[PDB]
Amino acid sequence: PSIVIASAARTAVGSFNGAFANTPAHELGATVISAVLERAGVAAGEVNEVILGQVLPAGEGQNPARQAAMKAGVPQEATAWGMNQLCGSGLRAVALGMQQIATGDASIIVAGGMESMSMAPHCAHLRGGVKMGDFKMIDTMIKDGLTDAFYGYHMGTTAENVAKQWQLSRDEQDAFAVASQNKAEAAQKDGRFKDEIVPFIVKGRKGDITVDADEYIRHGATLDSMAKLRPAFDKEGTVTAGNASGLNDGAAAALLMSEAEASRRGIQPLGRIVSWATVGVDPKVMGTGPIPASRKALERAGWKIGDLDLVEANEAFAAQACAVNKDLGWDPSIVNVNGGAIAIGHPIGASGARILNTLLFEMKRRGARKGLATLCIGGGMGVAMCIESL
Amino acid sequence: PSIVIASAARTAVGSFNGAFANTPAHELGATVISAVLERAGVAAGEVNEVILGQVLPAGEGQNPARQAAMKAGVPQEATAWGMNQLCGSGLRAVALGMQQIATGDASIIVAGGMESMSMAPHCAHLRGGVKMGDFKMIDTMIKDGLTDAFYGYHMGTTAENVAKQWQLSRDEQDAFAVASQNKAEAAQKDGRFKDEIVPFIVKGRKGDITVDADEYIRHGATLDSMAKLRPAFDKEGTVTAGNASGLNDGAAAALLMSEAEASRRGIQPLGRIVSWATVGVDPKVMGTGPIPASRKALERAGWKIGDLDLVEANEAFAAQACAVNKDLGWDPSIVNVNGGAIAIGHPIGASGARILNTLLFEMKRRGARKGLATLCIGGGMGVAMCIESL
Amino acid sequence: PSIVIASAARTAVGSFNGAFANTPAHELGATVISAVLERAGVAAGEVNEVILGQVLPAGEGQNPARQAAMKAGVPQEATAWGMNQLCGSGLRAVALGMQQIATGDASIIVAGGMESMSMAPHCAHLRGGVKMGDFKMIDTMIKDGLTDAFYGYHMGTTAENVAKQWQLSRDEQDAFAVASQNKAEAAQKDGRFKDEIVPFIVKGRKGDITVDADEYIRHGATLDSMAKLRPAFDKEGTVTAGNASGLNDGAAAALLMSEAEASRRGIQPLGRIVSWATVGVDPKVMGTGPIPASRKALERAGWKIGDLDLVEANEAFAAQACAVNKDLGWDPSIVNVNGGAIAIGHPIGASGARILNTLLFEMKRRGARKGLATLCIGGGMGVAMCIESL
Amino acid sequence: PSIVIASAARTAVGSFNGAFANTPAHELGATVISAVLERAGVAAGEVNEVILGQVLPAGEGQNPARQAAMKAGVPQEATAWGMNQLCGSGLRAVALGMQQIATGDASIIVAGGMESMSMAPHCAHLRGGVKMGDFKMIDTMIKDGLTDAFYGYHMGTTAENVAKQWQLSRDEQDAFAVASQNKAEAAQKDGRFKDEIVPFIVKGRKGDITVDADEYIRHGATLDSMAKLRPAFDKEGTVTAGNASGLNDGAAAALLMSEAEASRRGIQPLGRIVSWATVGVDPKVMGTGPIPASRKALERAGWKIGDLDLVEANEAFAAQACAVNKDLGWDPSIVNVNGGAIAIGHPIGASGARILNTLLFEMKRRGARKGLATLCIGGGMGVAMCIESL
């Protein structure tokens, strides 16, 4: 079996409690579902199934994958579900949709992710009732999204372990950070993010606001302002708000079919899924995930690391990203060419299909042939996908 | 590729705020992951992935699939993820595990679902603040678990939708409920749940307790206690607490590998998987989804309805249970043979793997060669899976 | 001016989440207002104002004193208000009521207090929003009722402070506690609380229940059972759940008018208010408040300590009650002759009027001429009142 | 006995979730206590008691009046208490303080009120527990401050009741409202609130901010802007956000002593308390409370309405302030000469002391001999006080 991504689409990535602050994740998904359809020239009625990565759906109601597909004009007769491999979710769902077609269970899939970190609620187990004493209202964003369930600290603490252990300085983390911002700023101003970003309409009482730009990219980000910041997690540490990714909203997806079905319907695919892999790692240093995963991926495809023409390797933190690129040995000038998540955002469920978009459209936009994606995952994992142009 | 369930186990279904009142989902899943590896005689180090359905993880921490897997002693090596096709999750998880192996993406999987409806919290989105006025704390079990996202009403009102369309009166639904309970109270006492139940140790402070019995099986269910219950959803309706399944906790799973690997390891499998399907229906009448799903999977297997020796059609509601039995027309006597969910419980995320357990052990018990599981799903879907024994 | 207490009444004191678990404090208040009126032969239309101490009114609605007055049939032309000097409240309200008559502003006042520690809610300030991170739902009973605002610790710690200062052993404290229980039991059995208690009807759904006995009094309390408790505030402490008072519900009040008015009406009053006083102490030793307050009240009356025939010294904690008794040196045999708050309970805003009721009805029973009621107060205060029989 | 007001002060009145959005009421109180002391030349060590009206103390900790006293340097030997007669509180407190002096129980009292409507929390009674389903988090500001407990509707509905009863047009109410704003703007600009206001320093991480101006007063308020507003309580009503007072934070107080004691110390007092009164009315028309309370206060003083030189009649709503003025018939030109609560705000427990401050400092500046302050009260009450210059 041979599967292509016929088309791809993402919302812009919103900043925490910003442009999308009150926008449910499935709203962002419904637009992205309609956009991949409209891009490939496929009708909504032809979709066999909608898969959406999503980490924090508490309070959005029954199966927000189905809400997203239904709002988007997908018929009741198709199916829809969500899944969760954390930061890996958005790219994994694409691998899961790829499997759907390989087995002869579906022909055409919409796969990706969607997150609204903004709309994640606070929660408390209250059925027994609280006879007396204070109790906690738990921020599900932190608890279920960013906190290690075994060691009880933030993801930023796992980045410190990795920084200490590869001997990455506070200066090196900030230089990779200021670089990521600079490459994103240059790309946005260069209209490199136009093709992939589908504009989203935030409906309001005293005004509709059209959002088609990444609002988290800081313009003119310097080395002086970076170096002034405090360590956010470790009191004598190195990882900061500046060289770490942020809390963000967005959605992103890809319409998948068999290669020959694309051809039939006169589509001109953005890429061909040659391989994928997920692998586990020690939770303390989850950020190194992308090393074994990208090496399993590459083995599965039959490529050496030096065959890749372009890479998106997620920037969860400046610490881990640098360590991944140090290990893998790929030319840093092909990595994250239009910047990284430190500049653009980290909408967790969406993140993997958010970079799938950036790589596919840049593979298009420079005539690259081979190209990989990879992301570290909390609790100790990595995921990757190899993509070959047609 | 031919894929076989080498083993299968499940916790007892627990009552709502009962024996597993304060037991998180991943503790029950962790018992279930151990008991499948123990029964097959396969170690945890051999497991590539853990795939667990779960509808209600809010509050539980990052990726509880990974938590259940690490507490099982499946090493950091393997990966693990959660997924959500609502009541269908537990069985879909099995189909997906089967998919990982069919595409050569892995060797050995443990697929199923878990659910603590008891531990599901109240929540509200409070980042914007509430400048003034009262607000609602939302019961996530109801909002994300049981309430249709489109018409905004509970699944017991979709059972009024189906009860009117197939003219199923109150005396027909009280007949199916008592007799599910009677079949369920006959199996539990006669030991027919023994094999498929692994006991769970509810760790306390002043007394460890061992649970190993479906506590939600009321003993001596008469028709006269059934007919005096008031309607629970529509004020002049036919769906009461008596002719519907309840809120419950539990976990349920299966070890997957190729037939040639089980054949290899000297494992006599519970059964080969021959097909599966999932189909969407009108969300108003969501309980008719097993009808299309059972028909699609029966075609993918090459079977007829008459070929089936044993069947689990999950009893979400008495209305929709008699609606699938009427349309599909299979012999009533070969279906939900040991009773069903009205009598056992409805642990949503795990319910799919709960009935699949019951099928595979009652397929080994009576010498059935063919068996279909199937389930209705909120938002309007169904899932089916055909199993032949070896 | 000479002001008398024409009549008094109180409810039984309810155990925490016991008989009165779902009864708003103003319902208890309304019954006691009705009772004082009946008992004095005074009509509700004759009341000028109602003054009710109440520490924990959150969620009860606008000015619960007014709610109580209105429910009791006191006319809309009268007025009502609440006040808060913590445990001193119910007694202070009586002094404030006396002052309305002394200054010629009113003729007829109903004064006392009311409290439902059970119905006190959890709260959080949510207007600003909680942009990110956990937050506490605060138990208002603990925070506004029982925690010192300066040192941050519970009243129980102030008790340890006094235990250490006065070198009071765990054995002396436990003895005092058991004595309280045994006195209260004996008094209850002999009918000594009948005159003071007005029965309260708890209106249900499946039956009304009449409460006319103090439910917190433990019958057959043993020294052993007290000796086996663990310290409740300091892990190497002496103050326990046993030798501390409890968390309780109740109301209590007095009807006041001038001595000349009672004579006009032919009323035989329960007592003349001869003096009162309130004084501050260090918050860390707040249990000592009764010492300066009592001495100041006695000086104002022109009485020596030895002139007192009966004393109600409130038992917040055994440690502080023992310190008070040691310092003042009054004959312990005339203090709390029918037991105290360790046995009976501590409904904060009501307590001072609860112990006035006990003192008044006992002084009548035994023909005692001179009495005194006193309490300690959180944050370092005392209140006392001198009463003489007519 | 003859009691004087030796000195007075208030904070600026803050807008809802404005300047004082995160300032607990006792911090504002403490600044006002320090101020009255400074202004009278009286030391904190000389204060016997502090009495502070406060409607919304939930979550603030034990007895915020004590907390305010202690922060201001008032010794632990003094006492303090809070009280609640709703909007009447901060004026009622002054009368209560007067009575402590008249009955010989104290020499020096600090009395007024304090309120942080901004900091009032949301709450819910959670001890029994929520077995299942949604429940309400109740805004304590609305529930305990602004909702009638008998009729279940907002104070603004009682204003509509008065508007209908007195036939007061939308246009008359709006004219009154604009006049209030324009009078307050003029007084603010001319420096008339400087004498009464003590500046309050709001402490901040990145800057302390001094607040010495009433921030709620609208500059350049137009009749057209008022006329365009929608009714806020009744869809065919007349009462709007514009012609109602607002939700506000502030504190305000008076230092009291005997006339002879002021003379001993060489203090020129702001006024002698000549009389006070409080009376009840029907809760449905609570806005009329000032009518019988004022008449009763004047009777007690031996004054005719025509004898008054200046009046502060608090403006909870235009409708009721108009009714009061029409009934009493005092010259509108001497009422609220510096504007009123519609413009300045309505910090509920502080308001009666805020208007007394405004009355006193205006009497001083214009040499007015006789003054009256009055407020309406939720639940159907009025309070009034008569003041004469020395």
Coordinates of N, CA and C in Angstrom, one line a residue, chain B residues 70-175:
Chain B
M70 N 3.5 1.8 32.5 CA 4.6 1.8 33.4 C 4.4 1.1 34.8
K71 N 3.2 1.2 35.3 CA 2.8 0.5 36.6 C 2.7 -1.0 36.3
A72 N 2.4 -1.4 35.1 CA 2.4 -2.8 34.7 C 3.8 -3.4 34.7
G73 N 4.8 -2.5 34.4 CA 6.2 -3.0 34.3 C 6.6 -3.2 32.8
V74 N 5.7 -2.7 31.9 CA 6.1 -2.5 30.6 C 7.1 -1.4 30.6
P75 N 8.3 -1.6 30.0 CA 9.5 -0.8 30.2 C 9.3 0.6 29.6
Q76 N 10.2 1.5 29.8 CA 10.1 2.9 29.2 C 10.2 2.8 27.7
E77 N 10.8 1.7 27.2 CA 11.0 1.4 25.8 C 9.7 1.5 24.9
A78 N 8.7 0.9 25.4 CA 7.4 0.8 24.6 C 6.8 2.2 24.6
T79 N 5.8 2.4 23.7 CA 5.0 3.6 23.7 C 3.6 3.4 24.2
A80 N 2.8 4.4 24.4 CA 1.5 4.2 24.9 C 0.7 5.4 24.6
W81 N -0.6 5.2 24.2 CA -1.5 6.3 23.9 C -3.0 6.0 24.2
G82 N -3.7 7.1 24.5 CA -5.1 7.0 24.7 C -5.9 7.4 23.5
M83 N -7.2 7.0 23.4 CA -8.1 7.3 22.3 C -9.5 7.2 22.6
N84 N -10.3 7.9 21.9 CA -11.7 8.3 22.2 C -12.7 8.2 21.0
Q85 N -13.3 7.0 20.9 CA -14.6 6.9 20.1 C -15.7 6.6 21.1
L86 N -15.8 7.4 22.1 CA -16.8 7.2 23.2 C -17.1 5.8 23.6
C87 N -18.3 5.3 23.5 CA -18.6 3.9 24.1 C -17.9 2.8 23.2
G88 N -17.5 3.2 22.0 CA -16.7 2.3 21.1 C -15.2 2.1 21.4
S89 N -14.6 2.9 22.2 CA -13.2 3.1 22.4 C -12.5 1.8 22.7
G90 N -13.1 1.0 23.6 CA -12.4 -0.3 24.0 C -12.2 -1.3 22.9
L91 N -13.2 -1.4 22.1 CA -13.0 -2.3 20.9 C -12.2 -1.8 19.8
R92 N -12.3 -0.4 19.6 CA -11.6 0.2 18.5 C -10.1 0.2 18.8
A93 N -9.7 0.4 20.0 CA -8.4 0.1 20.5 C -7.9 -1.2 20.0
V94 N -8.7 -2.3 20.1 CA -8.3 -3.6 19.6 C -8.0 -3.6 18.1
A95 N -9.0 -3.0 17.3 CA -8.8 -2.9 15.9 C -7.5 -2.1 15.5
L96 N -7.2 -1.1 16.2 CA -6.0 -0.3 16.0 C -4.7 -1.1 16.4
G97 N -4.7 -1.8 17.5 CA -3.6 -2.6 17.8 C -3.3 -3.6 16.7
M98 N -4.4 -4.2 16.2 CA -4.3 -5.1 15.1 C -3.7 -4.4 13.8
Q99 N -4.0 -3.1 13.7 CA -3.5 -2.4 12.6 C -2.0 -2.2 12.6
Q100 N -1.5 -1.7 13.8 CA -0.1 -1.6 14.0 C 0.7 -2.9 13.6
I101 N 0.1 -4.0 13.8 CA 0.8 -5.3 13.4 C 0.6 -5.7 12.0
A102 N -0.5 -5.3 11.4 CA -0.8 -5.6 10.0 C 0.1 -4.9 9.0
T103 N 0.5 -3.7 9.4 CA 1.4 -2.8 8.6 C 2.9 -3.0 9.0
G104 N 3.2 -4.1 9.8 CA 4.5 -4.3 10.3 C 5.1 -3.2 11.1
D105 N 4.3 -2.4 11.7 CA 4.7 -1.3 12.6 C 5.0 -1.7 14.0
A106 N 4.7 -3.0 14.4 CA 5.0 -3.6 15.7 C 4.9 -5.1 15.7
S107 N 5.1 -5.7 16.9 CA 5.1 -7.2 17.0 C 4.0 -7.6 18.0
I108 N 3.9 -7.0 19.2 CA 3.1 -7.4 20.3 C 2.5 -6.1 20.8
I109 N 1.1 -6.1 21.0 CA 0.4 -5.0 21.6 C -0.5 -5.4 22.8
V110 N -0.9 -4.5 23.6 CA -2.0 -4.7 24.5 C -3.0 -3.6 24.3
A111 N -4.2 -4.0 23.8 CA -5.2 -3.1 23.5 C -6.5 -3.4 24.4
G112 N -7.2 -2.3 24.7 CA -8.4 -2.3 25.4 C -8.9 -0.9 25.9
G113 N -9.6 -0.8 26.9 CA -10.0 0.5 27.5 C -10.0 0.4 29.0
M114 N -10.0 1.6 29.6 CA -10.2 1.8 31.1 C -11.2 2.9 31.3
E115 N -11.7 3.0 32.5 CA -12.7 4.1 32.8 C -13.0 4.2 34.3
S116 N -12.7 5.3 34.9 CA -13.2 5.7 36.2 C -14.2 6.9 36.1
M117 N -15.5 6.5 36.0 CA -16.6 7.5 36.0 C -16.8 8.1 37.4
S118 N -16.5 7.3 38.4 CA -16.4 7.7 39.8 C -15.5 8.8 40.0
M119 N -14.3 8.7 39.5 CA -13.2 9.7 39.7 C -13.3 10.9 38.7
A120 N -14.2 10.9 37.8 CA -14.4 12.0 36.9 C -14.8 13.3 37.7
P121 N -14.1 14.4 37.4 CA -14.3 15.6 38.3 C -15.3 16.6 37.7
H122 N -15.7 17.6 38.5 CA -16.4 18.8 38.1 C -15.4 19.8 37.6
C123 N -15.8 20.7 36.6 CA -14.9 21.6 36.0 C -15.6 22.9 35.5
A124 N -14.8 23.9 35.3 CA -15.3 25.1 34.7 C -14.1 25.8 34.2
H125 N -14.3 26.6 33.1 CA -13.3 27.4 32.4 C -13.3 28.7 33.1
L126 N -12.2 29.1 33.7 CA -12.1 30.2 34.6 C -10.9 31.1 34.4
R127 N -10.2 31.0 33.2 CA -9.1 31.8 32.9 C -9.5 33.3 32.6
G128 N -10.6 33.4 31.9 CA -11.1 34.8 31.7 C -11.6 35.4 33.0
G129 N -11.9 34.6 34.0 CA -12.5 35.0 35.2 C -14.0 35.1 35.0
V130 N -14.7 35.3 36.0 CA -16.1 35.5 36.0 C -16.3 36.8 36.7
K131 N -16.4 37.9 35.9 CA -16.4 39.2 36.4 C -17.6 39.5 37.4
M132 N -18.7 39.0 37.0 CA -19.8 38.9 38.0 C -20.9 37.9 37.6
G133 N -21.7 37.4 38.6 CA -22.8 36.5 38.4 C -22.4 35.0 38.7
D134 N -23.5 34.2 38.9 CA -23.3 32.8 39.1 C -22.8 32.1 37.9
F135 N -22.1 31.0 38.1 CA -21.7 30.1 37.0 C -21.9 28.7 37.4
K136 N -21.8 27.8 36.4 CA -22.0 26.4 36.6 C -20.7 25.6 36.6
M137 N -20.5 24.7 37.7 CA -19.5 23.7 37.7 C -20.1 22.5 37.0
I138 N -19.4 22.0 35.9 CA -19.9 21.0 35.0 C -19.4 19.7 35.4
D139 N -20.3 18.7 35.6 CA -20.0 17.3 35.8 C -19.4 16.7 34.5
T140 N -18.1 16.5 34.4 CA -17.5 16.1 33.1 C -18.0 14.7 32.6
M141 N -18.3 13.8 33.6 CA -18.9 12.5 33.2 C -20.2 12.7 32.4
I142 N -21.0 13.7 32.7 CA -22.2 14.0 31.9 C -21.9 14.8 30.7
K143 N -21.1 15.9 30.8 CA -20.9 16.8 29.7 C -20.1 16.1 28.6
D144 N -18.9 15.5 28.9 CA -18.0 14.9 28.0 C -18.3 13.4 27.8
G145 N -19.1 12.8 28.7 CA -19.3 11.3 28.6 C -20.7 10.9 28.0
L146 N -21.7 11.7 28.4 CA -23.1 11.2 28.2 C -24.0 12.1 27.5
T147 N -23.6 13.3 27.2 CA -24.6 14.3 26.7 C -24.2 14.5 25.2
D148 N -25.2 14.3 24.3 CA -25.1 14.6 22.9 C -24.7 16.0 22.7
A149 N -23.7 16.2 21.8 CA -23.1 17.6 21.6 C -23.8 18.4 20.6
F150 N -24.8 17.8 20.0 CA -25.5 18.5 18.9 C -26.9 19.0 19.3
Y151 N -27.7 18.0 19.8 CA -29.0 18.4 20.3 C -29.0 18.8 21.8
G152 N -27.9 18.4 22.4 CA -27.7 18.9 23.8 C -28.5 18.1 24.9
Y153 N -28.9 16.9 24.5 CA -29.6 16.0 25.5 C -28.9 14.7 25.7
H154 N -29.2 14.0 26.8 CA -28.5 12.8 27.2 C -28.8 11.6 26.3
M155 N -28.0 10.5 26.4 CA -28.2 9.3 25.6 C -29.5 8.6 25.9
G156 N -30.1 8.8 27.1 CA -31.4 8.2 27.4 C -32.6 8.9 26.7
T157 N -32.3 10.0 26.1 CA -33.3 10.7 25.2 C -33.1 10.2 23.7
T158 N -31.9 9.8 23.3 CA -31.7 9.0 22.1 C -32.4 7.7 22.1
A159 N -32.5 7.1 23.3 CA -33.2 5.8 23.5 C -34.8 6.0 23.5
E160 N -35.2 7.2 23.7 CA -36.7 7.6 23.5 C -36.9 7.7 22.0
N161 N -35.9 8.3 21.3 CA -36.0 8.5 19.8 C -36.1 7.1 19.1
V162 N -35.3 6.1 19.6 CA -35.4 4.8 19.0 C -36.5 3.9 19.5
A163 N -37.0 4.2 20.8 CA -38.2 3.5 21.3 C -39.5 3.9 20.6
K164 N -39.5 5.1 20.0 CA -40.7 5.6 19.3 C -40.7 5.1 17.9
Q165 N -39.5 5.0 17.3 CA -39.4 4.6 15.9 C -39.5 3.1 15.6
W166 N -39.3 2.3 16.7 CA -39.5 0.8 16.6 C -40.7 0.4 17.5
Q167 N -41.5 1.4 17.9 CA -42.7 1.1 18.7 C -42.5 0.1 19.9
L168 N -41.3 0.2 20.5 CA -41.0 -0.7 21.6 C -41.6 -0.2 22.9
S169 N -42.6 -0.9 23.4 CA -43.4 -0.5 24.6 C -42.6 -0.7 25.9
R170 N -43.2 -0.3 27.0 CA -42.6 -0.4 28.3 C -42.4 -1.8 28.8
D171 N -43.4 -2.7 28.4 CA -43.4 -4.1 28.9 C -42.4 -5.0 28.1
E172 N -42.0 -4.5 26.9 CA -40.9 -5.2 26.1 C -39.5 -4.9 26.7
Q173 N -39.3 -3.6 27.2 CA -38.1 -3.2 27.7 C -37.8 -3.7 29.1
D174 N -38.9 -3.9 29.9 CA -38.8 -4.4 31.2 C -38.5 -6.0 31.1
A175 N -39.0 -6.6 30.0 CA -38.7 -8.0 29.8 C -37.2 -8.2 29.5

